[PDB]
Design a protein around this ligand. Structure first.
Ligand SMILES: CC(=O)Nc1cccc(CO)c1
Ligand SMILES: [Mn+2]
Ligand SMILES: [Mn+2]
Lengths: 137, 137
């Protein structure tokens, strides 16, 4: 059977600024870097940044809702979000439609999110404030 | 401080075939569905399918290398790949790197992968045979 996410690979247009974003700004751990990529971890997540000449810097109105959310604790959430804001990190969404979340963009316009809470906690919240037509299995 | 991947959200053009693909073909657990999305899990992975009229069914030549790899054991790899093949699921790349990998497309052209092997395994292989320009930290 499938047993989780083995890795997330993001295509990047400029490797050095992307490594700086994920390692310096977001605090992920850099394990290795080469001419065409980098390997980082964020807790158990294996993140690969892959230099791709096809990657375009994409404004958020031009891309669909596909996005990648990173876990953060309730105690750290607000100050991390505020630090990203003060650093000039672009955003893509304001309405909290799935709980406590901050929506921000990477240098290439990959849609990212800080989120507080597990799937179990989101299902429990949705039982009280369900999305239209929601059914639970 | 970020502690891991909280969730992966894929924009989908048609909810029913995407639910069938992830739940029935790929065996993920469906926890909830609503008029415009679904929540599934795959091991620790929280997957959200979000119905989005902006999602284009995208040929693999027209998207960049961004992709999502799921873990599977070596013992299960070949029969799962054969299941995808029987279902006519398209392949977007052949494997040329360490660890078994099967590169396949979802109904909207999201680039997926089955991979056997951890970051630690990849780093160990890279230390013995470093990529061009590779530096370790
Ligand atoms: C600061 C840093 O880690 N620089 C670096 C590492 C590996 C390769 C290259 C050149 O592609 C630069
Ligand atoms: Mn989200
Ligand atoms: Mn991969």
């Amino acid at each position: 059977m499938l047993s989780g996410l083995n890795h997330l690979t993001l295509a990047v247009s400029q490797l050095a600024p992307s490594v700086a974003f994920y390692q310096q700004l977001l605090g992920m751990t850099l394990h290795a870097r080469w001419d065409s990529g980098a390997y980082l971890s964020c807790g158990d997540l294996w993140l690969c940044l892959s230099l791709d000449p096809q990657r375009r810097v994409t404004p958020p109105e031009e891309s669909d809702y596909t996005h990648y959310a990173f876990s953060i604790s309730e105690a750290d959430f607000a100050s991390f979000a505020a630090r990203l804001e003060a650093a000039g990190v672009a955003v893509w969404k304001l309405n909290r439609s799935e709980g406590a979340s901050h929506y921000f963009l990477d240098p290439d316009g990959h849609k990212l999110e800080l989120h507080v809470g597990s799937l179990a906690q989101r299902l429990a919240a949705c039982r009280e404030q369900p999305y239209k037509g929601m059914v639970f299995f």
